[PDB]
Amino acid sequence: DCCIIRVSLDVDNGNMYKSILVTSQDKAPAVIRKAMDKHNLEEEEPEDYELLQILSDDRKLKIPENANVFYAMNSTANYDFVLKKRT
Numbered sequence: 001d002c003c004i005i006r007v008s009l010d011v012d013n014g015n016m017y018k019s020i021l022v023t024s025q026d027k028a029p030a031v032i033r034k035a036m037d038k039h040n041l042e043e044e045e046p047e048d049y050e051l052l053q054i055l056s057d058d059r060k061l062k063i064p065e066n067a068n069v070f071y072a073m074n075s076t077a078n079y080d081f082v083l084k085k086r087t
Contacts, residue, residue, distance in 0.1 A: 005073065007035045008054075010084040022069050029065035036083050048087045054080040 001024045008014035020035055032046045041049065053061040055077040063072050063081065073079055 003070065003073065004079070005069075006080045007038065007051075008080055008082050009039060010082055014054075014080070014082055016080070024068075024070050026069070027065075028063055028067050028069045028072060031069055032063070032065070032083075035081065039083065041083075049083050049085045052082045052084055054078065054082055 003022050004019060005022055006016055006019050008017045018038060020031070020038060022031055026034070029046065032051045035051060036044065036046070036049055051063045053063055053072070053074060055074060061072065
């Protein structure tokens with residue numbers, strides 16, 4: 001099992017930055033961390049920054065900890081995720 005997802009930043013620019021391959025075993029709060037980790041923000045906590053799915057300029061879904069990636073991700077339109085600072 002695997003899924004291909006895209007990650008983009010609020011902090012610098014979006015559209016496409018890097019892609020992460022996720023399995024069903026690795027959970028969304030860990031991916032929250034992994035994707036920001038992968039953007040080198042290993043030292044910062046999700047307590048400040050958090051991750052959002054972007055489809056196409058309207059329905060944009062914030063991705064929290066209790067949601068499974070495999071379920072919270074859409075596949076249907078665009079699989080982009082943006083990490084945003086909420087502080």
